[PDB]
Structure 1
């Protein structure tokens, strides 16, 4: 059973106008099997619109491609993103009063490199409010996190969404 195609696609922005379907494919086939690979072009001039997309056979291949950034394609560093609200911070809710920094770190560090963990406390009492923010060094960590159906941290089923 195949993962949904939408989860296997990478939008590639910032292309060289000389990049073709063929040269984009030759580049990104290094990290997996490509079932689709298109450069977007003007319908009348055929001049590149400077972006395109590739579809891999599996999500693990998408991961491999994202972990191989930066990608220099036909001499230009391009900008791949999963199928955009491009942020590096998440809101994590439902962690109650017993969840600590190391719980959040041990779980979320496997999505990306963590720069800040902020466990929210009440301004008046100092009691934990039951939510936190995690800031990563890169947006793909967040993009991987928010497409999961479930997040279990410290036994709690958590609500996770993009923050600012």
Structure 2
């Protein structure tokens, strides 16, 4: 079983009318939910406007994220994977033989790429062995940086959020 943290979505921007039950009914469209909670004030029981859902598998999380935008109880909400929000990554260790198509063909499977920037030496124009990739959506980055490994053009790459 995948670690539970990797199976959780934080759902921000809830309708205050959303309940555990309606949040669950919504998000069960994309998978089995092992947990589903709307955060409320301990005293007033008034919604705090966010909650979390936990799916049985990461593929279900992916399904839910791919089904954004989610309108729950009339309001578009903001699902994000639980922490381990940017659209850009640093990709290091790609050396001088890694080209844009290597980066694209790999990373485009995480989501839509807007910019690939292979870093070259300001003086010499030689590849510096790292790149930045900008995606159209943060979940691409969130999926990427939770991976233990990235292999691109046969290189073991170091990938992290870029800001």
Asked whether the two chains share a fold, i.e. TM above 0.5, the reply is yes
Q: Is the 8 A contact 2:84 2:146 kept in 1?
A: no
Unaligned runs of 5+ in 1: none
Q: Compute the displacement of 1:85 (Å).
A: 9.6
Q: What is the alpha-carbon distance in structure 2 between the residues aligned to residue 157 and residue 27 of structure 1?
A: 39
Q: CA RMSD in A?
A: 0.9
TM-score, normalising length: structure 1 = 0.98
Q: What is the alpha-carbon distance in structure 1 between the residues aligned to residue 152 and residue 8 of structure 2?
A: 28
1:12-40: CA deviations, max 9, x gaps?
Answer: 00000000000000000000000000000
Q: Compute the displacement of 1:88 (Å).
A: 0.1
Q: What is the alpha-carbon distance in structure 2 between the residues aligned to residue 132 and residue 67 of structure 1?
A: 26
1:89-115: CA deviations, max 9, x gaps?
Answer: 000000000000000000000000000
Q: What is the alpha-carbon distance in structure 2 between the residues aligned to residue 103 and residue 141 of structure 1?
A: 17
1:31-71: CA deviations, max 9, x gaps?
Answer: 00000000000000000000000000000000000000000
Unaligned runs of 5+ in 2: none
Match for residue 55 of structure 1? 54
Q: Between Structure 1 and Structure 2, how many residues are aligned? A: 163
Misfit runs of 4+, over 6 Å: none
1:127-149: CA deviations, max 9, x gaps?
Answer: 00000000000000000000000
Q: What is the alpha-carbon distance in structure 1 between the residues aligned to residue 84 and residue 15 of structure 2?
A: 23
**Cα distance 1:84–1:147, how it changes in 2: closer, same or farther (>3 A)?**
closer
Q: What is the alpha-carbon distance in structure 1 between the residues aligned to residue 68 and residue 84 of structure 2?
A: 19
Give the SS at the match of 1:11: strand
Q: Compute the displacement of 1:84 (Å).
A: 5.6
Q: What is the alpha-carbon distance in structure 2 between the residues aligned to residue 44 and residue 103 of structure 1?
A: 54
Q: What is the alpha-carbon distance in structure 1 between the residues aligned to residue 64 and residue 116 of structure 2?
A: 27
Q: Is the 8 A contact 2:81 2:142 kept in 1?
A: yes
TM-score, normalising length: structure 2 = 0.99
